[PDB]
Subunit: 181 residues, 4 copies
């Protein structure tokens, strides 16, 4: 829901502690004199050498940082004065296939890759509706990309007829990754 | 520039031929009585069993289709009456690093992956400007993700100072793929 | 444990059925006159047009094949006379990190990719022993490939001292994928 | 041919320099008193804090290291006394398809991934022989995994007949990545 990082006045997560859920242009404001240890529970975050998000940068990933050298590659400075969460830009291609019409029953989500066999994913229900959130996909009736093919583009298919299936049957899907125009 | 597919009245790319650069809701219009062979030079395209982009679907990828069974998995019908190019939705994470300021000199493009060493890619120039088109990246001064770190988010950095580098030096980059908020 | 495929005399998995757990150079031997439908539960398998694993080839992946055209792209022939499982050659790079010495306690397996943060995988125990089954890896004390580095090559490390850690602490790992010699 | 790394007595690649093409259990032997800068041209290499490949570890990737802090994350010690190249264990799945029999003419190498269209790779010759070095692959006559299928396992196919092709025609290939036994 929120990013979450905890700063400690002392190493080893010792001393006065302070939780942040958003940017802090001036950490002195949290009462902790000079961060000594940091604990990141929901990130990532970028911390700065100076206030206002200026000077040397340090990116913090989920995990434990028990001392300043754990985060300053340069080992330039031990100063940590500003923090902010990072909104990561990370684009996947995703399609969700559902057992029943209208996006109900068992579901199967596929992120970016091709799947030559749904039963090998434990999916063995029929496919009555599909939601394509991104990417260009091709669904096939049988495993190994065989039988009738259905082009699946961004959009909602509430029923199998909408994608052209004569029966709510899909057993493989592949993503179209290239265009030569 | 345009998609390009050529339909032949006969198998083996024989007979009256017709080039399409866009959708054809009714192939009879091209003079070719019943497509016998198809050649795709810039795709992909989706063809349909009936006019107006109705009935069984067939997706065509760059390559040669010398006969109807080469494209109809069902082998249901041999009918090909409508065609249209497919606009593929395919999202990459890309960053371009340039030798000189302002996006000039030698360049290096990185698509989605991490690169622990620029010299192993043949890139050994300094890095003075960066263009991030998508993704969240972290640039480092030395190979193996060492030294000063620079967070690189969508945007243009005309000079190294804009990304916080004290010198136009970058030798590794990694992409931030997850957020826990 | 064994591959498993079931052949039916009739379409739709109807009629006399027969389970195979190994190669059948002559399917007539199973009593089913001409396979009509096939069900693959543990594969893949390769089937042949003629006996003895001769003629047209058809590869079967986990899933349901309710009729012959579901498996013969050519749609050449409807004949299925020999079957054999395929031993797939599929090489991964794998490392397992364990909470306690000697390969005990909680464990974390990593297949081929880099992991910048163990806590983001739900792993937050210390790392006392490592098993590297394949690949060249580099373990680091903190997230984001920071702190002491430990080169991890094929082999068993029963205790953290064997990999050179001063403490059973590892929070990131990356695989070395290239050599320039 | 050999790994190659050059050690300099001074920072910025200054001073007495020494090239290594193999392990050096005691760098004092090269005349350079305390490495100040390192240049890696063919690696990777692992360096050690003490002689004989003991103490803190530092992995060196192709690139420039102008000062000691460029390589010691700990920033523990500035000592570099032993070096050795790393033999990387890195397993790919590779298949090479050739225009003419016997592994001659134009060639196309495929490493690990599926290729739905050879013409989209610029390959438009026929395929008369195949070398599979690793992996389990399936070759198809037309693009998009259509037409006759040929199972391609580790081994040499000097002519198209050996893989069962009736014509030296292959336009797509996919790798079989899973086995359920």
């Amino acid at each position: 829901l929120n990013p979450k990082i905890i700063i400690f006045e002392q190493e080893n997560f010792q001393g006065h502690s302070h939780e942040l859920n958003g940017p802090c242009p001036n950490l002195k404001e949290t009462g902790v004199e000079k961060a000594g240890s940091v604990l990141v529970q929901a990130g990532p975050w970028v911390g700065y050498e100076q206030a206002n998000c200026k000077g040397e940068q340090f990116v913090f990933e989920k995990g434990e940082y028990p001392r300043w050298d754990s985060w300053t590659s340069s080992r330039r400075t031990d100063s940590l004065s500003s923090l902010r969460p990072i909104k990561v830009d990370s684009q996947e291609h995703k399609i969700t296939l559902y057992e029943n019409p209208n996006f109900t029953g068992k579901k199967m989500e596929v992120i970016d890759d091709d799947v030559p066999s749904f039963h090998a994913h434990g999916y063995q229900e029929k496919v009555s509706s599909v939601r394509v959130q991104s990417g260009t996909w091709v669904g096939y009736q049988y495993p190994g990309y065989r039988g009738l093919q259905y082009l699946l583009e961004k959009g909602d298919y509430k029923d199998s007829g909408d994608f052209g299936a004569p029966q709510p049957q899909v057993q493989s899907v592949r993503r179209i990754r290239d265009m030569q125009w």
